[PDB]
Structures are given as structure tokens and as C-alpha cells.
């Protein structure tokens with residue numbers, strides 16, 4: 147996917163609620179650094195819903211592809227208030243950006 151496009155998607159659709167940098171602060175949503183290969187609900191010091199805490203999946207390329215299409219379908223009860231990203235290419239660009247930025 148395209149990291150620069152993915153970065154723009156992130157800035158416009160996610161960055162008001164999320165940071166990605168190491169040590170980034172929690173806002174409405176959790177800091178996302180380290181997300182890849184980690185279970186749901188593991189950002190240190192963030193208070194998740196019980197459903198996000200107990201979803202029990204590992205974040206990676208394919209689970210982010212599904213989740214970001216319709217968060218509340220993937221985790222009913224989530225407090226992430228976000229309709230989703232319908233186009234797979236936008237999702238794939240965004241996820242390429244996250245795999246860089248949350249690992250950098």
C-alpha cells in the first residue's frame with residue numbers, strides 16, 4: 147500500500163482521536179504505537195471498553211482490514227465512534243502507513 151496516502155487518510159480520519167508515535171499521548175482513543183502483533187486492549191494506561199479489552203484478536207494487516215471497514219460490527223459496543231472506511235484501497239494504504247508509523 148501507499149504510506150503517503152495512508153498518512154493523509156490517517157491525518158484526516160483518525161488523528162483527532164489517535165496518535166501513533168512512541169510515547170504519544172492518549173486522546174479520545176488510545177496511542178497506537180506497537181499495535182501490530184498485539185492483542186486488542188493493550189495500549190498501556192488506556193481504559194478500554196470491556197468489549198475492546200476482551201475481543202481477543204491480534205492486530206495486524208488482515209484484522210485491521212476487517213475492523214476499519216465497520217468498527218462497531220467487528221466489536222459491538224466499542225466506544226470508537228467511526229463509521230468505517232468502505233474502499234479496500236484506502237484501508238490498505240492506511241494500514242501500510244500504520245505498519246510503518248506504529249513501528250517507527
Ligand code: HEC
Nearest residue numbers: 159160163174175186187188189194195198224225226227
Ligand atoms: C482512523 C480510521 C482510525 C483508526 C485507524 C483507528 N481509530 Fe480508533 N478508537 C477510538 C476509541 C475511543 C477507541 C477505544 C475503543 C474501545 O475501547 O471500545 C479506539 C480504538 C481503536 C483501535 C483498537 C486499539 C486497541 O488497542 O485495541 C484501533 C486499531 C483504532 N482505534 C484505529 C476513537 C476514535 C475516534 C474518535 C471519534 C476516531 C475518529 C478514531 N478512533 C479513528 C480511528
